[PDB]
Design a protein around this ligand. Structure first.
Ligand SMILES: C[S@@+](CC[C@H](N)C(=O)[O-])C[C@H]1O[C@@H](n2cnc3c(N)ncnc32)[C@H](O)[C@@H]1O
Ligand SMILES: C[S@@+](CC[C@H](N)C(=O)[O-])C[C@H]1O[C@@H](n2cnc3c(N)ncnc32)[C@H](O)[C@@H]1O
Ligand SMILES: C[S@@+](CC[C@H](N)C(=O)[O-])C[C@H]1O[C@@H](n2cnc3c(N)ncnc32)[C@H](O)[C@@H]1O
Ligand SMILES: C[S@@+](CC[C@H](N)C(=O)[O-])C[C@H]1O[C@@H](n2cnc3c(N)ncnc32)[C@H](O)[C@@H]1O
Lengths: 232, 211, 238, 237
C-alpha cells in the first residue's frame, strides 16, 4: 500500500486499485510511487510513501502502540521459528510485530474473545502481511511454547500455566500501575519470578536547523510492560 | 555444570538459556556494544522484515548484528562491515555462539570503500563515530522510501550528520531518545529504580527519496 | 485578591472579584470563598495557577522551570537579582518571593507593550514593592559593578548580555538562562568562554504528572513534552 | 560563614574555625574568598550544602525540595508545618520561602535526628523563624486553621491527615514526599476519609547534561528516582 502525507504531517493510508481515486488518481500516486511527490487539483502536494509497520498500525482501520509493541518482541526474546501465544487480537498491530519476528516458518498463535474484533484484525493483517503464519482463534484464551503475550484487561486471569517452556516469558501490556500489582500478586500461586516492570519511552526531538529541541508536545504514557520468567 | 542442565530451575541461584538482551549485555567485549533498548527500536526504525537485505557498520562486539540478523530472517541477509580487526572477530565469535544461522556476511575494512549494489539494500543500520562519511556510500545502496538509522551519543554529532545530509538525498524523519524506565518491585515496595542508565545515544532516522 | 474557579472537567478560570461582577455572581464566590463551592470550586490561586492563566503578551516562563531557576540562582531573602526580559512578568513573581521585602528584583524589558502587561500582572498578585521595572535592552543599561547576587535570563540572545552580566554580577554568583533550543545552549556556552564564567549546569527539568482516580492510576497520556533547557554559569573572582 | 571547595577533579565543605587547615589554612581560604584560589573556594549554594552536609536521616532531594515549595505555594510571611525534620534539608528550603517574618514549625520524633538537624540548619541559616519540637506531629497541639501549608517527609504520612487538616486553612495544600507508589495510593486512599481533594501526583527530574565541547550529551549516569510528590488541597470546612 501507500502513505500520503501533507505539509502539516497528516497522513493518508491508501490501497490503490486501477481507476482508483483518493481528487487524485492512484495511477499518478503509482507514477511517483514511494519516494516521489504528487500534486493535486487543489495543488496541495502529498509525498507518496511505502508504509512501515509503524505508520500502518497508526492509520489502519484500539491498537497496541508501536513503541511498546516493539519492546515486547525484545522482551519475549522472540527469535526465528518460534511459537507464541497472543490475545489480543483486537485490531492486530501487535500480531504483525510478532508474525514478523517468527519468520514464515515460525507460527504465532492468536486468540480473541470478542468477534467483530478478530474480523477487523485479520482484515488488517490480510492487507499488509500476505503471509499466513499466524493462527487465529475466536475465543477466550503443554510446555511447548516459546512465548505468551497479552493486551487484555485481565492477564492475571488467563495465567497459559503449562503452555510455556522454561526460559520463556509472559509479557502483559497494562496501562495502570494498579493492574500490574493486581497481576503481580497472582504470581504467589504460580512458578514465576518477576524480572522486570518498565514503561517504554520514545522521546521525539524536533530538528529543523538551527531549531533543535525535544518536542513540546509528546505522548507521555501508553502503558507499562511486566516480565515474568517460568521456573520448571 | 550438570545440575544446571538437569534444572532447566534452581541450583545450589537461578539459571537460564540467555535471552538476546542478556547475552548482549553479558557477552564479551571488543568495543562497547550498542545497548538493547535502542537496537529493539532501531529494527523498527529500519522497518526490517523477514527476507530483507540490510547494511551495517560497524560491528564492534557484534551486538547490533544479532538484533539485525534475527530480524531479517534466514533468507534475508545482513551485510556488515568493520575496520578494526580484533573487533570484527569478537563480533564473528559472539554472533556464532548465539546465532548459528549463517545469514550474516562479514567484511573487513571501512564501509566507505565497500563495493555494494545500487538500490539493493532495504536499510542501513549505522553505529560509529563519524556517520556523515558513509552518507554517499549508504545513499547509493539504499532504496526509495527506505531508511538509514544512526546511533549517535552526542547531540553535536546528530546536528553534524543532519547538516551534512543536506548534500545527499534524504529527508530527516526522526531524532529520538529511547527510554526504558525500570523498577525494583519486591511488593508492596514499588518504585522506579533509584539507579538508572540516563542516556546512551540518540537515534537519527533518514529517509531516502528517489534520485 | 484574584480568585480561581474550576469545574468537573478540571478546566480553570481566573477571576478578578468585584461587587456586581458577573461570572454565577461574584460576591457569591466571596461568601463561599477559597476552598468553598458554588458544581464550581473557588480558590486563592497559586503562583503556578496564576502564571498558567494570567493574561500574557509574551509567553511567561514555565512554573517548573522558574521554580528551578530560583534554586540554581541560590536566592535567599535580601538578595539583589537582575532580570531580563520581564515578558509577562512570570519569572519576576518567582524572583520577588525568593528575595522578599528586604531584597530586590531589578528587571529590564525592551518592549513597552509587553512591559505594561508584565507590570499589570505583577501588581494584581504581588503587593510587595520589591521589584524595580526598567525599560530597554539590558545591553545598554547602566549598572553598578559586582552589586548583584544573580542574573536571571529569559531571552533569545543571552550571549549579547554576557559582558554586562559578568560586570554586574558578584564574584562566585550565578547566571541562569532559559533556552528552548539545544543549539542556543551550545552558542551561549561557546560564548561564555570569552567572559569570566565557568559553565556549571545544563539541565532539563521535568514535572511528570499522573492521573489517580483510583482504581485508575497512571502517568498522564498527554504531557507537556518540553519547554527549555536551563544553563547555569558561575562568575569567577576577577 | 561556611565554605565549599572544588578540586581539579571537581568534587567537594570547610567550616572555618580560627587557626585551622584543610594543605592550606582557613585564613588563607577567607582571603582568596568566593571564587578564589588556594582547589578553589566558593560560598556554598543551598543545593550544594544540603548534599554535602552530615545526615543522620536522608534529606529530601533539592529538586524535590525545590518543587515542594512551589506546590505548597509559599510566599514570605507564611507559617508552614513540617515533619519529619530528619537532617534538616527540606527545612532550609522552607525557611527561605517564608522569610524572616514567616515561620517553619517543624517536628521530629527521633532525637538523634533532630540534634544534627538543628546543627545543620543553624550553621547555614541563622534567621530565627524555625520552631523545633522533639516528638510526633499527630500528637502535637496546634491552632486550628492557622497554617498555610504542611510539608511531609515520613514513612507513614497517612497518619497525620486528621491533625494536618486541623492546622491547615481552606485551599491550602499538604504536599508529601513518598518513595514508593504503593505508599502513594494508601495515602490517596486514606485521604478519602479526610477533608482533601487530591490535586497532584508528579515526578520531578533534573536531567543533567555534560557539555564539554565538542562533547554534548545528557549524562550516562543520572538519578533514576527519588520520590513521588503528593499534593492534597484542603476543603473549606
Ligand atoms: C485492542 S487489542 C490490544 C492491543 C493490540 N495488541 C494491538 O494490536 O494494538 C485487544 C482486544 O481484544 C478484545 N479482548 C481482549 N481480551 C478480551 C477479553 N478477555 N474478553 C473480551 N474481549 C477481549 C478487546 O476487544 C480488545 O479491544
Ligand atoms: C562502537 S562499535 C559498535 C558495536 C556494535 N554496534 C555492537 O552492538 O556490538 C562501532 C565500530 O565501528 C567501527 N568503525 C568506525 N568507523 C568505521 C567505518 N568507517 N567503517 C566500518 N567500521 C567502522 C569502529 O572500529 C567501532 O569498533
Ligand atoms: C519569553 S519572554 C520572557 C518570559 C518570562 N519568563 C516571563 O515570565 O514573562 C521574552 C521577553 O524578553 C524581552 N527581551 C528580549 N530581549 C531583550 C533584551 N535584550 N533586553 C531586555 N529585554 C529583552 C522581550 O520584551 C520579551 O517580551
Ligand atoms: C528520612 S528523614 C526525613 C528527611 C527530611 N525531609 C530532610 O530533608 O532531612 C525521617 C525522619 O523523620 C522523623 N519522623 C518520622 N515520622 C515522624 C512523625 N510521625 N512525626 C514527626 N517526625 C517523624 C524521624 O525522626 C526520622 O529521623
Amino acid at each position: 500500500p501507500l502513505l500520503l502525507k501533507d505539509r502539516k504531517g497528516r497522513a493518508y493510508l491508501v490501497f490503490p486499485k486501477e481507476g482508483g481515486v483518493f481528487s487524485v488518481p492512484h495511477e499518478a500516486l503509482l507514477e511517483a510511487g514511494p519516494g516521489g511527490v504528487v500534486r493535486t487539483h487543489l495543488g496541495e502536494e502529498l509525498s507518496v510513501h511505502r508504509p512501515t509497520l509503524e505508520e500502518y498500525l497508526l492509520h489502519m482501520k484500539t491498537p497496541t502502540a508501536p513503541k511498546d509493541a516493539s519492546a515486547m518482541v525484545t522482551l519475549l526474546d522472540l527469535a526465528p521459528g518460534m511459537r507464541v501465544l497472543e490475545a489480543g487480537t483486537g485490531s492486530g498491530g501487535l500480531t504483525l510485530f510478532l508474525a514478523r519476528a517468527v519468520g514464515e516458518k515460525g507460527l504465532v498463535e492468536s486468540y480473541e474473545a470478542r468477534p467483530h474484533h478478530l474480523a477487523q484484525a485479520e482484515r488488517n493483517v490480510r492487507a499488509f502481511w500476505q503471509v499466513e503464519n499466524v493462527r487465529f482463534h475466536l475465543g477466550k484464551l503443554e510446555a511447548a511454547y516459546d512465548g505468551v503475550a497479552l493486551d487484555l484487561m485481565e492477564p492475571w486471569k488467563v495465567l497459559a500455566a503449562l503452555a510455556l517452556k522454561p526460559d520463556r516469558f509472559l509479557v502483559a501490556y497494562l496501562p495502570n500501575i494498579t493492574q500490574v500489582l493486581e497481576l503481580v500478586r497472582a504470581a504467589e500461586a504460580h512458578p514465576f519470578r518477576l524480572e522486570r516492570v518498565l514503561e517504554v519511552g520514545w522521546r521525539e526531538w524536533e530538528v529543523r536547523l538551527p531549531v533543535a529541541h525535544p518536542r513540546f508536545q509528546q505522548v507521555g504514557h501508553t502503558a507499562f510492560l511486566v516480565a515474568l520468567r517460568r521456573w520448571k
